[PDB]
Amino acid sequence: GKQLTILGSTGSIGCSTLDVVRHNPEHFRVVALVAGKNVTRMVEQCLEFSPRYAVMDDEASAKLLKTMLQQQGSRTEVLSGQQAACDMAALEDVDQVMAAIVGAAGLLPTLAAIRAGKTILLANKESLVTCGRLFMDAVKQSKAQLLPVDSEHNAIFQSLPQPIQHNLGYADLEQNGVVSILLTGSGGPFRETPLRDLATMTPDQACRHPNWSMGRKISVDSATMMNKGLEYIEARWLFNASASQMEVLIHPQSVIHSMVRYQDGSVLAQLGEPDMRTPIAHTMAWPNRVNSGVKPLDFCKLSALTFAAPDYDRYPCLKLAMEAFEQGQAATTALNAANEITVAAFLAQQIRFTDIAALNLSVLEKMDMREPQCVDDVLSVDANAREVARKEVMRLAS
Amino acid sequence: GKQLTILGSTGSIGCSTLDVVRHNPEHFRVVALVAGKNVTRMVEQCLEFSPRYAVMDDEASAKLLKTMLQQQGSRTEVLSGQQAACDMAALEDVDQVMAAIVGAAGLLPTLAAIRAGKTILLANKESLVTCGRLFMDAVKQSKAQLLPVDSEHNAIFQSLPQPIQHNLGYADLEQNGVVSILLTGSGGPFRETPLRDLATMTPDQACRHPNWSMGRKISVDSATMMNKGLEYIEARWLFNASASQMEVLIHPQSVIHSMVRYQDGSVLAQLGEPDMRTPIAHTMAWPNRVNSGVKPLDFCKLSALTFAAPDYDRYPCLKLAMEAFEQGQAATTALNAANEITVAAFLAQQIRFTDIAALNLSVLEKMDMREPQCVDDVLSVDANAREVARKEVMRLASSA
Numbered sequence: 001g002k003q004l005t006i007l008g009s010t011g012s013i014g015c016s017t018l019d020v021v022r023h024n025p026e027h028f029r030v031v032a033l034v035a036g037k038n039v040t041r042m043v044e045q046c047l048e049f050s051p052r053y054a055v056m057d058d059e060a061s062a063k064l065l066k067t068m069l070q071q072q073g074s075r076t077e078v079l080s081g082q083q084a085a086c087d088m089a090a091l092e093d094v095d096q097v098m099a100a101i102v103g104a105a106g107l108l109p110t111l112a113a114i115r116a117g118k119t120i121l122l123a124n125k126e127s128l129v130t131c132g133r134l135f136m137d138a139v140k141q142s143k144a145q146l147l148p149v150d151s152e153h154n155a156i157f158q159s160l161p162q163p164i165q166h167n168l169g170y171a172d173l174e175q176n177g178v179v180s181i182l183l184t185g186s187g188g189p190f191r192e193t194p195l196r197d198l199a200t201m202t203p204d205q206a207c208r209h210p211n212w213s214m215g216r217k218i219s220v221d222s223a224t225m226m227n228k229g230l231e232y233i234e235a236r237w238l239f240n241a242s243a244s245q246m247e248v249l250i251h252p253q254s255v256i257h258s259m260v261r262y263q264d265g266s267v268l269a270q271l272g273e274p275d276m277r278t279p280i281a282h283t284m285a286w287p288n289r290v291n292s293g294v295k296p297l298d299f300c301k302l303s304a305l306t307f308a309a310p311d312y313d314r315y316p317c318l319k320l321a322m323e324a325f326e327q328g329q330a331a332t333t334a335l336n337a338a339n340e341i342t343v344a345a346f347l348a349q350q351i352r353f354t355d356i357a358a359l360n361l362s363v364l365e366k367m368d369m370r371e372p373q374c375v376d377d378v379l380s381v382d383a384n385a386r387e388v389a390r391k392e393v394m395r396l397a398s
Numbered sequence: 399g400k401q402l403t404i405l406g407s408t409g410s411i412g413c414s415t416l417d418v419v420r421h422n423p424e425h426f427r428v429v430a431l432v433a434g435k436n437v438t439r440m441v442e443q444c445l446e447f448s449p450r451y452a453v454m455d456d457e458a459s460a461k462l463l464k465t466m467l468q469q470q471g472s473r474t475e476v477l478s479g480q481q482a483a484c485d486m487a488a489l490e491d492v493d494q495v496m497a498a499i500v501g502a503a504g505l506l507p508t509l510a511a512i513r514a515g516k517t518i519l520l521a522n523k524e525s526l527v528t529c530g531r532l533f534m535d536a537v538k539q540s541k542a543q544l545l546p547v548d549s550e551h552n553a554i555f556q557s558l559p560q561p562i563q564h565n566l567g568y569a570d571l572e573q574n575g576v577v578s579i580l581l582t583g584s585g586g587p588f589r590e591t592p593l594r595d596l597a598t599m600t601p602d603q604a605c606r607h608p609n610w611s612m613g614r615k616i617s618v619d620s621a622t623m624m625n626k627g628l629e630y631i632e633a634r635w636l637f638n639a640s641a642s643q644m645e646v647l648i649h650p651q652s653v654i655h656s657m658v659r660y661q662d663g664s665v666l667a668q669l670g671e672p673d674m675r676t677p678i679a680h681t682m683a684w685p686n687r688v689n690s691g692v693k694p695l696d697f698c699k700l701s702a703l704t705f706a707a708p709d710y711d712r713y714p715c716l717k718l719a720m721e722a723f724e725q726g727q728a729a730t731t732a733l734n735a736a737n738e739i740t741v742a743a744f745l746a747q748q749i750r751f752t753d754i755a756a757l758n759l760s761v762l763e764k765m766d767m768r769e770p771q772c773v774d775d776v777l778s779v780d781a782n783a784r785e786v787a788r789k790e791v792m793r794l795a796s797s798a
């Protein structure tokens with residue numbers, strides 16, 4: 001069937017991807033698995049999926065993996081480091097690359113796949129949040145097919161016409177009858193919290209999403225709507241959408257995953273169970289479909305679906321991200337990096353919930369960097385913004 | 399650009415279609431307008447849009463129109479009768495035909511369009527309610543493209559993958575990753591009425607749809623969910639869906655217009671403002687899009703969206719329709735015809751709201767017709783079912 005390289009195989013998206021292959025063993029052959037330090041999970045994945053190669057970024061991890069696969073009788077070839085990860089993404093016989101490495105580390109392996117003209121199942125945030133200009137230029141150049149894995153972008157992609165789906169990132173929305181892209185977001189645990197009380201919210205309260213169970217960092221991004229601000233940046237790049245072609249809508253139940261408004265009045269949407277195997281199986285099978293293991297959405301067991309307009313006084317981070325987009329990749333890169341710093345400080349009880357947006361803004365004000373021209377330039381902006389942000393945190397706590 | 403015939407130009411769908419044309423003069427040229435008796439409307443449309451031909455089914459109506467148009471100096475050629483109506487649907491130079499004639503009268507002109515390999519903007523219900531097998535066999539043979547205008551079927555079509563859209567009727571749902579078609583319906587004004595109260599509901603209560611302004615017959619079909627039952631019949635034909643590939647859901651707000659469920663768990667849906675120009679414009683511009691005059695749906699001004707499973711004790715006509723499908727076009731034709739009669743009798747206060755489903759069932763029980771093999775056979779089932787139904791109404795209004 002299709003030959004896959006999975007970048008970040010041991011993480012949450014990687015495991016979900018492998019479950020899709022598990023459900024479809026005649027449609028997908030795992031050629032290469034790439035991870036960072038989780039040797040234990042990597043051994044089990046090598047023993048199940050029989051890849052030609054397994055790469056650990058960490059050298060000690062690669063050495064341990066080799067000894068365990070040997071002890072277990074597997075002939076999977078073990079590589080290490082970043083060049084090896086890029087080589088797997090670029091293998092002549094692979095069809096699809098699941099781009100699921102977390103952070104700036106996912107950037108060069110992702111680009112290797114784009115440069116090799118692969119089908120990219122895109123689930124690394126930094127690719128378009130930080131490198132949207134560079135990566136979209138590179139996709140046009142190699143004719144790589146991007147297929148977004150993130151639930152919102154995937155929902156938009158499924159609700160978009162064929163000429164846009166082929167040509168993703170270069171097609172013209174208006175020419176294809178599209179008025180706007182409707183990005184939906186839960187609004188987080190503090191949708192109805194009095195504004196006064198936001199300053200005193202605790203990490204446990206911020207991470208206590210009534211509709212989720214997720215990592216703490218992304219839980220907090222959901223409470224601030226920084227997570228939607230970042231998807232807004234990705235969406236503008238992915239779908240070639242101007243600011244007037246984007247709408248952000250609060251949808252508390254998260255049943256509708258996002259939508260697309262058309263010239264005749266029609267709105268197309270994707271709905272489903274909250275399970276990343278759906279969007280992953282969509283991207284792996286496109287333009288066809290496969291079983292993902294996800295059960296059919298039961299419309300008789302739903303909460304009523306509601307929508308509201310986001311209030312920028314309640315979600316300053318959402319506005320910041322929209323503004324940062326206008327200023328360029330140095331600003332979006334800086335916002336992303338600042339935000340990692342400030343959220344981790346919030347979680348470590350070094351700053352208040354409301355300090356996240358105020359410090360993110362403060363970093364952006366302090367910076368003026370010029371437009372990145374390559375991945376080294378973005379990495380440099382990211383590194384600088386983190387330092388600015390860590391000093392801002394220390395100031396507040398001191 | 400696109401040359402069209404509008405069959406039933408003077409009615410509600412016809413006027414809405416001409417509005418889309420009005421908004422898009424460089425994309426659509428009106429070649430032929432066809433109607434029944436509405437001469438006044440037909441004159442205005444001929445004046446504004448300058449069709450090559452206008453036909454009236456009624457001969458006196460067509461004679462009137464001929465004079466009126468000559469005076470006003472229009473060059474439109476006025477014709478009369480059903481053959482002329484079918485010929486307009488088959489014109490060589492015509493690309494699309496808006497099939498918006500009401501009732502059994504829409505059948506031969508719609509079929510004429512299909513036999514000619516046209517793109518058919520399908521509105522007429524009887525086409526697939528009564529002739530579903532005949533018409534889908536015919537489209538498969540000429541490779542005519544059907545594009546459903548009805549809100550539900552249009553929403554389903556837009557939520558279906560491209561290989562199904564382009565081979566509509568013939569394509570295999572399963573092979574294309576589709577597990578089922580989710581047909582949504584409002585549930586009508588009696589959605590929460592105590593069942594025991596249904597028997598005493600008045601015509602005015604049944605037509606008082608909180609969320610709709612439409613005709614009395616269709617309003618009552620909405621209250622009984624006969625309207626959903628007829629759309630179920632149509633959907634099974636149109637989309638090549640087996641019984642297990644269909645789900646009917648009550649959705650009181652009618653914001654989601656219907657949906658498609660895929661193998662991976664994804665559900666695709668079409669939503670929009672309740673305005674027929676949206677699905678009409680979708681069909682006219684497909685595979686592209688066009689402005690329709692319809693305003694963008696305001697998600698911040700909506701009732702909460704809810705869903706429920708239909709109770710067949712509350713909606714026996716829905717279940718009748720589903721059963722009728724399994725019995726064939728003779729049964730769906732008879733159901734449709736019995737229902738025209740029993741609904742009009744209800745609205746005339748000859749029978750009770752609950753006598754619609756009971757008499758519709760009784761007519762089906764008394765019929766014993768062979769599978770129709772052509773439109774003429776269908777028209778004969780329809781005539782006979784009407785007479786059986788009329789007699790059932792009279793039996794009930796007179797005696798026991």
Ligand SMILES: NC(=O)C1=CN([C@@H]2O[C@H](COP(=O)(O)OP(=O)(O)OC[C@H]3O[C@@H](n4cnc5c(N)ncnc54)[C@H](OP(=O)(O)O)[C@@H]3O)[C@@H](O)[C@H]2O)C=CC1
Pocket residue numbers: 007008009010011012013014034035036037038039057085099100101102103105106123124125126149150151276
């Ligand atoms: N989780 C989700 O629902 C969604 C996540 N995303 C995005 O997808 C990406 C992955 O998310 P998720 O799967 O949750 O993250 P995880 O943290 O669960 O997984 C990260 C993966 O990347 C690996 N990794 C880290 N550094 C390197 C490196 N230097 N080289 C190679 N591999 C490395 C990890 O390996 P190891 O554990 O072995 O060290 C792990 O396999 C992120 O960018 C995230 O923002 C987007 C849409 C949905």
Ligand SMILES: NC(=O)C1=CN([C@@H]2O[C@H](COP(=O)(O)OP(=O)(O)OC[C@H]3O[C@@H](n4cnc5c(N)ncnc54)[C@H](OP(=O)(O)O)[C@@H]3O)[C@@H](O)[C@H]2O)C=CC1
Pocket residue numbers: 405406407408409410411412432433434435436437454455483498499500501503504521522523524547548549674
């Ligand atoms: N209205 C809606 O929202 C929808 C309706 N439908 C279906 O579309 C079809 C039409 O609905 P709608 O437009 O509301 O109906 P109308 O009753 O408003 O219009 C019927 C049209 O057909 C014409 N007509 C009647 N008999 C003949 C005949 N024998 N020969 C030629 N023309 C004839 C009428 O002409 P005249 O008035 O001049 O006599 C009129 O133009 C129906 O089958 C309906 O079920 C489907 C989806 C949505």
Ligand SMILES: O=P(O)(O)Cc1ccccn1
Pocket residue numbers: 184185186187188209211212221222227228254274
């Ligand atoms: O829409 P977001 O709030 O950013 C993330 C989220 C929260 C709950 C359920 C699904 N997704």
Ligand SMILES: O=P(O)(O)Cc1ccccn1
Pocket residue numbers: 582583584585586607609610619620621625626652
């Ligand atoms: O879904 P149905 O009830 O058949 C027709 C209908 C009624 C009200 C609003 C929209 N459509």
